[PDB]
Amino acid sequence: EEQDSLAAFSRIEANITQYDPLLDNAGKSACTCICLKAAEMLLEASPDQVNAGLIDDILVEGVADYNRFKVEHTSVENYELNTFELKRLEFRDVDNPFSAEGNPYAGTLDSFAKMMEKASDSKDLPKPVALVMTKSNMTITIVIRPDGKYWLFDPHGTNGKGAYIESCNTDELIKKIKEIFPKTSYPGMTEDENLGFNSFEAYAVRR
């Protein structure tokens, strides 16, 4: 009496199609709002609650919240986190000399694994905790679960569906990010070009 879920499958996809009018009308600018809705709903969930209908709910309610607030700057900071029942937690790259307290975690794609290790082994970040990560105006949500697994929620639109969630171990998560946010690299690329093509920012939130 239950739908297929993350308890038995490592990937679950929405029923809502990639080009459904609700998603097509809302732009890619709605991705950050949808990802904050994903944090809200997934941080409250257990693996067997995460089925295709829950992903559908994230998309629809995420778009509803986005339409209420639109009219663009669509950073996590532009949304009022209490309306998502979320709390922001301090989380940044203290090793980066340009970073300041209160900044998000910012770096190049090469720093992804380090970010995840700091997030998973930090006392200041309880579990479950979500990272909302933006690269080149596209956003994903990564849920760090107390069972050591990671849920990757990706609203980019894949295989004809509006979003999917994948449950990953540490190394598989690293490998999947390389596919979602491919790094730009060519012989002779400067660090200035690397920062311009390959930077991301991430915010940490909890319920």
Residue numbers in the entry: 283 to 353, 358 to 493
Q: What is the paper's account of this structure, in its own sentences?
A:
Deubiquitinating enzymes (DUBs) cleave peptide- and isopeptide-bonds downstream of ubiquitin. By performing a comprehensive bioinformatical screen, followed by biochemical and structural characterization of interesting candidates, we were able to identify active members of this family in a wide range of eukaryotic species and a few host-associated bacteria. Due to the similarity to the herpesvirus proteins, we refer to this extended enzyme family as VTD (for Viral Tegument-like Deubiquitinases). While some VTD activities resemble viral tegument DUBs in that they favor K48-linked ubiquitin chains, other members are highly specific for K6- or K63-linked ubiquitin chains.
In the di-ubiquitin cleavage assay, Wc-VTD1 showed a strong preference for K6-linked chains. In order to gain insight into the functional differences of bacterial VTDs in comparison to their relatives from viruses and transposons, the structure of Wc-VTD1 was solved in the unbound form at 1.8 Å resolution as well as in a covalent complex with ubiquitin at 1.9 Å resolution. The tertiary structure contains nine α-helices and seven β-strands, adopting a fold with overall similarity to the viral and transposon-encoded VTDs. The catalytic triad is formed by Cys319, Asp440, and His442. As previously observed in the M48 crystal structure, the conformation of the catalytic histidine appears as non-productive for catalysis due to the large distance to the cysteine. The structures in the unbound and complexed state can be superimposed with an RMS distance of 0.538 Å over 144 Cα-atoms excluding some 40 residues, thus indicating little overall conformational changes upon binding to the Ub-PA substrate. On the opposite side, helix α1 (residues 302 to 305) together with the following amino acids 306 to 311 is also shifted by a distance of about 8 Å. However, helix α1 itself does not seem to be involved in direct interactions with the bound substrate. It is located on the surface rather distant from the active site and is involved in the crystal contacts between the two crystallographically independent molecules in the apo structure. In fact, the available structure and mutagenesis data suggest an attractive three-step model for explaining the K6 specificity of Wc-VTD1: In the apo-form, the α1 and α9 helices are far apart and the catalytic histidine residue is in a non-productive conformation.
